[PDB]
Amino acid sequence: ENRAQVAARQHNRKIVEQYMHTRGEARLKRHLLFTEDGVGGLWTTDSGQPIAIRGREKLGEHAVWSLQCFPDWVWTDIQIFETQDPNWFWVECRGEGAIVFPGYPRGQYRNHFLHSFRFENGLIKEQREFMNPCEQFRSLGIEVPEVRRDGLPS
Amino acid sequence: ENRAQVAARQHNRKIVEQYMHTRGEARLKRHLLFTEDGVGGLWTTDSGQPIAIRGREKLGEHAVWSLQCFPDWVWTDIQIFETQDPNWFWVECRGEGAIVFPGYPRGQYRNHFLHSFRFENGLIKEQREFMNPCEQFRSLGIEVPEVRRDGLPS
Numbered sequence: 099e100n101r102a103q104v105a106a107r108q109h110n111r112k113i114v115e116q117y118m119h120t121r122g123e124a125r126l127k128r129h130l131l132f133t134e135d136g137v138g139g140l141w142t143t144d145s146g147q148p149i150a151i152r153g154r155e156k157l158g159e160h161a162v163w164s165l166q167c168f169p170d171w172v173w174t175d176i177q178i179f180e181t182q183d184p185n186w187f188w189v190e191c192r193g194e195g196a197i198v199f200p201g202y203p204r205g206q207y208r209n210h211f212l213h214s215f216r217f218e219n220g221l222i223k224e225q226r227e228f229m230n231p232c233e234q235f236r237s238l239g240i241e242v243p244e245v246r247r248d249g250l251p252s
Numbered sequence: 253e254n255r256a257q258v259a260a261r262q263h264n265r266k267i268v269e270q271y272m273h274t275r276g277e278a279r280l281k282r283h284l285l286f287t288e289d290g291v292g293g294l295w296t297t298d299s300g301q302p303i304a305i306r307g308r309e310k311l312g313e314h315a316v317w318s319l320q321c322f323p324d325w326v327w328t329d330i331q332i333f334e335t336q337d338p339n340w341f342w343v344e345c346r347g348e349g350a351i352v353f354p355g356y357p358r359g360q361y362r363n364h365f366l367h368s369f370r371f372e373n374g375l376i377k378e379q380r381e382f383m384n385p386c387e388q389f390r391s392l393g394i395e396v397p398e399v400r401r402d403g404l405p406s
């Protein structure tokens with residue numbers, strides 16, 4: 099069983115590496131790193147609910163949208179964490195690039211990110227992006243509310 | 253070398269488990285799980301900058317404040333991830349409890365969390381909490397801005 103777990107982890111790590119370094123037009127084929135029923139998306143949003151992209155087909159459509167609205171995006175400072183589960187990885191990184199959201203001024207978006215990658219039979223079954231939405235608000239020119247700190251220790 | 257790394261990982265995991273299940277008055281001694289120069293705090297805030305608590309002494313003072321403003325806090329649904337670094341762990345969990353911030357109505361705070369734990373010589377050198385601040389806004393009655401989705405694929 100260890101042989102099977104070790105083999106899975108080494109292969110899966112390569113897929114995480116490839117995913118995190120896919121840029122430009124290659125993003126339009128990255129849905130092929132997912133299972134047919136794979137899920138990706140953003141788990142930290144203004145609503146408090148994830149926005150999940152369900153299925154390899156919808157993931158490929160989302161990649162077209164993402165390439166338009168984040169046309170020059172790069173992940174940076176990438177740290178890949180294997181876990182005791184050979185099919186579960188975490189990634190800490192930063193990311194930056196233009197943000198071109200419908201109805202908002204063109205902006206520059208920078209943030210810190212955590213990504214979760216869960217695998218099934220050599221491909222990504224679930225990818226989840228976690229960030230601070232306040233920084234995406236800022237990139238869009240949306241006012242960020244401020245918790246009053248006057249009564250808090252400083 | 254492997255024997256030392258295995259031993260470190262097994263000990264550090266016990267510390268993560270202890271940290272995540274420390275409640276009530278025991279929180280006032282949890283700073284003793286840190287190195288003398290250990291750091292803890294919140295990496296996801298409305299300002300976009302972490303709010304770090306630096307040093308075991310200041311972590312103990314922060315615990316007094318936290319016990320007042322989060323008096324019944326519980327971490328739930330705890331998943332501890334070991335990594336290839338025996339001194340680096342990640343935790344995915346939820347959390348819930350009253351929030352009693354100065355000058356805000358008493359509220360009920362629920363959120364999803366990721367925690368990073370980095371260890372040095374058997375104690376926590378760096379703890380970092382990551383969450384979606386929009387849910388803390390909601391718990392405090394602060395209006396959360398809404399990204400307009402009309403132009404986005406749905």
Ligand SMILES: O=C(c1ccccc1NCCN1CCOCC1)c1c(-c2ccc(O)cc2)sc2cc(O)ccc12
Binds near residue numbers: 138142404
């Ligand atoms: O940004 C997204 C998003 C949603 C799902 C999956 C990925 C997303 N972005 C992932 C961005 N990262 C980082 C940059 O480079 C690419 C990867 C949001 C919305 C959205 C909804 C439907 C869509 O068809 C497209 C976008 S609504 C909304 C509201 C918020 O408060 C915050 C974010 C969003």
Ligand SMILES: O=C(c1ccccc1NCCN1CCOCC1)c1c(-c2ccc(O)cc2)sc2cc(O)ccc12
Binds near residue numbers: 347381
């Ligand atoms: O909440 C905190 C906080 C700050 C530092 C360390 C831990 C914190 N909370 C940790 C909460 N978790 C979950 C609940 O149970 C305990 C653990 C925030 C502020 C703060 C500043 C100075 C202080 O002396 C005390 C609090 S300002 C502000 C603004 C925001 O937009 C969001 C959060 C905060």
